Design a binder for this molecule. Structure first.
Ligand SMILES: *[C@@H]1O[C@H](CO)[C@@H](O[C@@H]2O[C@H](CO)[C@@H](O[C@H]3O[C@H](CO)[C@@H](O)[C@H](O)[C@@H]3O)[C@H](O)[C@H]2NC(C)=O)[C@H](O)[C@H]1NC(C)=O
Ligand SMILES: *[C@@H]1O[C@H](CO)[C@@H](O[C@@H]2O[C@H](CO)[C@@H](O[C@H]3O[C@H](CO)[C@@H](O)[C@H](O)[C@@H]3O)[C@H](O)[C@H]2NC(C)=O)[C@H](O)[C@H]1NC(C)=O
Ligand SMILES: *[C@@H]1O[C@H](CO)[C@@H](O[C@@H]2O[C@H](CO)[C@@H](O[C@H]3O[C@H](CO)[C@@H](O)[C@H](O)[C@@H]3O)[C@H](O)[C@H]2NC(C)=O)[C@H](O)[C@H]1NC(C)=O
Ligand SMILES: *[C@@H]1O[C@H](CO)[C@@H](O[C@@H]2O[C@H](CO)[C@@H](O[C@H]3O[C@H](CO)[C@@H](O)[C@H](O)[C@@H]3O)[C@H](O)[C@H]2NC(C)=O)[C@H](O)[C@H]1NC(C)=O
Ligand SMILES: *[C@@H]1O[C@H](CO)[C@@H](O[C@@H]2O[C@H](CO)[C@@H](O[C@H]3O[C@H](CO)[C@@H](O)[C@H](O)[C@@H]3O)[C@H](O)[C@H]2NC(C)=O)[C@H](O)[C@H]1NC(C)=O
Ligand SMILES: *[C@@H]1O[C@H](CO)[C@@H](O[C@@H]2O[C@H](CO)[C@@H](O[C@H]3O[C@H](CO)[C@@H](O)[C@H](O)[C@@H]3O)[C@H](O)[C@H]2NC(C)=O)[C@H](O)[C@H]1NC(C)=O
Ligand SMILES: *[C@@H]1O[C@H](CO[C@@H]2O[C@@H](C)[C@@H](O)[C@@H](O)[C@@H]2O)[C@@H](O[C@@H]2O[C@H](CO)[C@@H](O)[C@H](O)[C@H]2NC(C)=O)[C@H](O)[C@H]1NC(C)=O
Ligand SMILES: *[C@@H]1O[C@H](CO)[C@@H](O)[C@H](O)[C@H]1NC(C)=O
Ligand SMILES: *[C@@H]1O[C@H](CO)[C@@H](O)[C@H](O)[C@H]1NC(C)=O
Ligand SMILES: *[C@@H]1O[C@H](CO)[C@@H](O)[C@H](O)[C@H]1NC(C)=O
Lengths: 238, 327, 42, 45
C-alpha cells in the first residue's frame, strides 16, 4: 500500500513535468484577466465617431464649443468600455467565487476529513487528500482505494441450516463451486460460515434463492471436548 | 443542464448588406469581438455542462438479454430497441412534453432570426448520445450497484444490491428478503405513477420549458429591437440613405448603430447571467449523478424525500430527470 | 505510403461492455490499487 | 477479550505487533464447571 502510494506520487511529478495543458483551468484565469485589460487599452484607439481618438489633438485643433461635442463622443464610448469591463469582471468574480466555495468545501471535506460522497474526492473510494498551492488556485492530490483483480463467485442472499435462515452480520456469502464462505464486500477474504459471522431470522421458505449449507458453532467442539474430558474421568473412576 | 448555443455578428445584425454602415461601425472598435467571444464562451460551456452531467461513465454498459432483476420491472426506464431514437418509454414522454423552438440543423420566427444574422448552433452530443450515456449509467446501476463508480463494474444479483441499500439506511437486510415481492410491487406501482404524472401534468417539465422559452423570447426581443428608431427619422437604413444627404444620413445611421449595439450588449449580458444559473444547475445535476446514481446518499433530501436507496437518470431536452427511489 | 490529413468522424462515447449479471453471480475484488490523482480549482 | 477483538493471520506479517494476553469469557465458566466436576468425582469416591 505504501509502495503503491509512493509510485503514484512519482506519476504526479512525471505528469506535471511533461505538459503545460494540465493547469489550463488556472492559466485561463490569468489569460482572461490579461486579455480583458489588453482589450480595454486597445479600445482607447477607437474614435466613437469623433474626429480623432487622441484627446489632445481635439484640444489642439478645435476650440471649446466645437471641441466639447468631440470630447463628449469619446467620454460616451470610453465609459461604455469601462461599464462593459466591470460587468464582465463581476460575472467572472461570481464564477471564481463558486469555485472558491467548492475548493473550501473540498478542503474541509477531503483534507480535514474522509468523504462518503461518491466522486467528490477523486475517482474511487476516498481515503484522504493533500492540498498543494498553485498561482491563483489549489491542487488536491486525492488518494483513493480502487478495487482490482476481481473474480466470479456464486452467491446466495441467505444460508439455510437447522430450518432457520441465516444472513451475514457484515459481508456476503460466496462459493468457489463446492464450499461456502462469508467474505467482506470490498475485498475477497473468505471465512467459515459461523454463528459469529451470521445472524438468524425466520425459516427456509420466505426467502427466494436460499441455499442449504452447514453453519458452524465454535462452542460445540469445546463443549464436546469437555465431554471427552468428563467421560475419561468416569472411565478412570470405574 | 444546458441552454441553446447562439452566435451573432455586428456586420449583419446592425446593418445587413450595408457597406456604408459597415464603415461607420469600424469606428466603435473591439465591442463586436467582445460580443462574439462572449457568446462563443457561453456556447463551448453548454457542451461542457452536458459532458460533466452525462459522460461520467468510461464504458457503455448494457443489460443482459434476460431482463429479470429480482422482480423489479425497469422496462419503462430501460431503452426501447424498436425505436429509431433508442430512448426509454419515460424519456419519450420528456421529449414530447418540452417543445424545442429551433434544433439549429441545416436550413417562422426561426427564419427571421437567421435573416438578421442571429444563429442557433447544435449541441456536440446528439440526443442519441445522451440516451447512450444515460442507458449506460442505468445498465451499470441495475447490474453492479455503486461499484462501477469506484472501479470496474462488478456484478451482484439485484435483490442483494437492494439488501445492501437497506443496510445503508439502517434497516437489516433480512427485512428486504421477507418483503421482496411487496418491495418490488411497491417499486413497480411507483414507476407506473411516473408515466401518468408526466402525461397528465401540463406544468411538470416547467424548468426545462422555461429555459427554451427564455432562449426564444430573448432572440425574438433582439430581432424586434431592429424596428426601433432610437431617435432617428426611421429604422429602415436605405430609407435614411435615400432621403437624406451623406452628412445628415450618417448621424441618423449612427443613432441606429448606437441603439442596435445596445440591444446586442443587453442580450449578451442577459445571456452571460442566464448561462451562470444554468451552470450552477449543471454542477448540481453532475453532483446528483455522482452521489445519487453512482452511489447511495446519507445526505438528507439530496436524493428526494425519504431515506435514499437508489436513483435512475433519464434524459430530457436541455436537461436531466432523476427518478429518486426512497424508503 | 501513408500521410497525415484532417479526418472527420462520429465521436465514440466509450468502449462497449456487457455486464455478466446473473440470478446468483457476484464479482469480488481480490486486490486493490491505491491511486493518486490531481484536481485543480481556481 | 475475544469479543472486543477479531483474529486474523499470525504474528509475523504485522509491523509493530505486541504480545499481550487476550481474555476468553468462556474460560471462567469452563474453569468453574471443572472444579465443580472434580468435586463430584471426589465426592463419588
Ligand atoms: C474450494 O475451497 C475449499 C477450501 O479451500 C477447497 O477444499 C480444500 O481442499 C484442500 C485440498 O486442496 C483440502 O486440504 C486437505 O487435504 C487432505 C485431504 O484429507 C488433508 O489430509 C489435509 O490435511 C488438508 O486438510 C482442504 O481440507 C479442503 N477444505 C475443506 C473445507 O474441505 C476446495 O477444493 C475448493 N474447490 C474448488 C473447486 O476450488
Ligand atoms: C434443503 O434441505 C431441506 C431439508 O434438509 C429440504 O427440504 C426437504 O424437501 C423435500 C422435497 O421438497 C421434502 O421431501 C418430502 O417431499 C414430499 C412431501 O412434500 C414427499 O414425496 C417426500 O417423501 C418428503 O416427504 C423434505 O421433507 C424436506 N425436508 C424438510 C426438513 O423440510 C430442501 O428441499 C433443501 N433445499 C434444496 C435447494 O436442496
Ligand atoms: C413491466 O411493466 C410493463 C408495463 O407495466 C409490462 O408491459 C405490459 O404488458 C401488458 C401485458 O402483456 C400489456 O398489455 C397489453 O397486452 C397485450 C399485448 O398486445 C394486448 O393484447 C392487451 O390488450 C394489452 O394492451 C401492456 O401494454 C404492456 N405495457 C407496455 C408499456 O409495454 C411488462 O409485462 C412488465 N414486465 C414484467 C416482467 O412483468
Ligand atoms: C404493509 O403494507 C403493505 C402495503 O403497502 C401491505 O400489503 C397489502 O396487504 C393487503 C392485505 O393485507 C393487500 O390488499 C389486498 O389483498 C387481497 C389481494 O391479494 C384482497 O383480498 C384484498 O381485498 C386487497 O385487494 C394489498 O394488496 C397489499 N399491498 C401490496 C402493495 O402488496 C402489508 O400487508 C403491510 N404489512 C403489515 C405487516 O401491515
Ligand atoms: C496485488 O497487486 C500487486 C500489484 O499492484 C501485486 O504486487 C506485484 O507483484 C508482482 C509479482 O507478482 C511484482 O512483480 C515483480 O515480482 C518479482 C519481484 O518480487 C519479479 O520476479 C518480477 O519479475 C517483478 O519484478 C510487482 O513488483 C508487485 N507490485 C508491487 C507494487 O509490489 C500483488 O502480488 C497482488 N497481490 C495478489 C494477492 O495477487
Ligand atoms: C512475543 O512472543 C513470542 C513468543 O514468545 C516471541 O517469539 C520468540 O522469540 C524468541 C527470540 O527470537 C525465540 O527464541 C528462540 O529463537 C531461536 C529459534 O528461532 C533459538 O535459537 C533460541 O534459542 C530460542 O529458542 C522464540 O522461538 C520465539 N517464539 C515464537 C513462538 O515465535 C517474540 O519475540 C515476542 N515479541 C516481543 C516483542 O517480545
Ligand atoms: C464471469 O463469467 C462470465 C461468463 O460466465 C462464466 O461461464 C463459465 C465459463 C464459468 O466460468 C462460470 O463460472 C461463469 O459464470 C464472463 O463473461 C465472459 O467472458 C469471456 C471472456 O473471458 C467472454 O468471451 C464472454 O463473452 C463473456 N460472457 C458473458 C455472458 O459476458 C466474465 O468475464 C467472468 N468475470 C470475470 C471477472 O472473469
Ligand atoms: C485417574 O484418577 C486419579 C485420581 O483418582 C488421578 O490421579 C489420575 O491422574 C487419573 N488418571 C487419568 C488417566 O486421568
Ligand atoms: C431468474 O429466475 C427468474 C424466476 O424463476 C427467471 O424468470 C429468470 O429468467 C432467471 N434469470 C436468469 C438469468 O436465469
Ligand atoms: C455426593 O455423594 C453422595 C453419596 O455420598 C451422593 O448422594 C450425591 O449425589 C453426591 N453429590 C455431589 C454433589 O457430588
Amino acid at each position: 500500500i505504501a509502495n503503491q502510494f509512493n509510485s503514484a506520487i512519482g506519476k504526479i511529478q512525471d505528469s506535471l513535468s511533461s505538459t503545460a495543458s494540465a493547469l489550463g483551468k488556472l492559466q485561463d484565469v490569468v489569460n482572461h484577466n490579461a486579455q480583458a485589460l489588453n482589450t480595454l487599452v486597445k479600445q482607447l484607439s477607437s474614435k466613437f465617431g469623433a474626429i480623432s481618438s487622441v484627446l489632445n489633438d481635439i484640444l489642439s485643433r478645435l476650440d471649446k464649443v466645437e471641441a466639447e461635442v468631440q470630447i463628449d463622443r469619446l467620454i460616451t464610448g470610453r465609459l461604455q468600455s469601462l461599464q462593459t469591463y466591470v460587468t464582465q469582471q463581476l460575472i467572472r468574480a461570481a464564477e471564481i467565487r463558486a469555485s472558491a466555495n467548492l475548493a473550501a468545501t473540498k478542503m474541509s471535506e477531503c483534507v480535514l476529513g474522509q468523504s462518503k460522497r461518491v466522486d467528490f474526492c477523486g475517482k474511487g473510494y476516498h481515503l484522504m487528500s493533500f492540498p498543494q498551492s498553485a498561482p491563483h488556485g489549489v491542487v488536491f492530490l486525492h488518494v483513493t482505494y480502487v478495487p482490482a483483480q476481481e473474480k466470479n463467485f456464486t452467491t446466495a442472499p441467505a444460508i439455510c441450516h437447522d430450518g432457520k435462515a441465516h444472513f451475514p452480520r457484515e459481508g456476503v456469502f460466496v462459493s468457489n463451486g463446492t464450499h461456502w464462505f462469508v467474505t467482506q464486500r470490498n475485498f475477497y477474504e473468505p471465512q467459515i460460515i459461523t454463528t459469529d459471522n451470521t445472524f438468524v431470522s425466520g425459516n427456509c421458505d420466505v426467502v427466494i434463492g436460499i441455499v442449504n449449507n452447514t453453519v458452524y458453532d465454535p462452542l460445540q467442539p469445546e463443549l464436546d471436548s469437555f465431554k471427552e474430558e468428563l467421560d475419561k474421568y468416569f472411565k478412570n473412576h470405574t | 443542464v444546458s441552454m441553446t448555443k447562439t452566435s451573432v455578428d455586428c456586420t449583419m445584425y446592425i446593418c445587413g448588406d450595408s457597406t456604408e454602415c459597415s464603415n461607420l461601425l469600424l469606428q466603435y472598435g473591439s465591442f463586436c469581438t467582445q460580443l462574439k467571444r462572449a457568446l462563443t464562451g457561453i456556447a463551448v460551456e453548454q457542451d461542457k455542462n452536458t459532458q460533466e452531467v452525462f459522460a461520467q461513465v468510461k464504458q457503455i454498459y448494457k443489460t443482459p438479454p434476460i431482463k429479470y432483476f429480482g422482480g423489479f420491472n425497469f422496462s419503462q426506464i430501460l431503452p426501447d430497441p424498436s425505436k429509431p431514437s433508442k430512448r426509454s418509454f419515460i424519456e419519450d414522454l420528456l421529449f414530447n412534453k418540452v417543445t424545442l423552438a429551433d434544433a439549429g440543423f441545416i436550413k417562422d420566427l426561426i427564419c427571421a432570426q437567421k435573416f438578421n444574422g442571429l444563429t442557433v448552433l447544435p449541441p456536440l452530443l446528439t440526443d442519441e448520445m445522451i440516451a447512450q450515456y444515460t442507458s449506460a449509467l442505468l445498465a451499470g446501476t441495475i447490474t453492479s450497484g455503486w461499484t462501477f463508480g469506484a472501479g470496474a463494474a462488478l456484478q451482484i444479483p439485484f435483490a442483494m444490491q437492494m439488501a445492501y441499500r437497506f443496510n445503508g439506511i439502517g434497516v437489516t437486510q433480512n427485512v428486504l428478503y421477507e418483503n421482496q415481492k411487496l418491495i418490488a410491487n411497491q417499486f413497480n406501482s411507483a414507476i407506473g405513477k411516473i408515466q401518468d404524472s408526466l402525461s397528465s401534468t401540463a406544468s411538470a417539465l416547467g424548468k426545462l420549458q422555461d429555459v427554451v422559452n427564455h432562449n426564444a423570447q430573448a432572440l425574438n426581443t433582439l430581432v424586434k429591437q431592429l424596428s426601433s428608431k432610437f431617435g432617428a427619422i426611421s429604422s429602415v437604413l436605405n430609407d435614411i440613405l435615400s432621403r437624406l444627404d451623406k452628412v445628415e444620413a450618417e448621424v441618423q445611421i449612427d443613432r441606429l448603430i448606437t441603439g442596435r449595439l445596445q440591444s446586442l450588449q443587453t442580450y449578451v449580458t442577459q445571456q452571460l447571467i442566464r448561462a451562470a444559473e444554468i451552470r450552477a444547475s449543471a454542477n448540481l445535476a453532475a453532483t446528483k449523478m455522482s452521489e445519487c446514481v453512482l452511489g447511495q446518499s446519507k445526505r438528507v433530501d439530496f436524493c428526494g424525500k425519504g431515506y435514499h436507496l437508489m436513483s435512475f437518470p433519464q434524459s430530457a431536452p436541455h436537461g436531466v430527470v432523476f427518478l429518486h427511489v426512497t424508503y | 505510403v501513408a500521410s497525415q490529413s484532417i479526418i472527420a468522424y462520429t465521436m465514440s462515447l466509450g468502449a462497449e461492455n456487457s455486464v455478466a449479471y446473473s440470478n446468483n453471480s457476484i464479482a469480488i475484488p481480490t486486490n486493490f490499487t491505491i491511486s493518486v490523482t490531481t484536481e485543480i480549482l481556481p
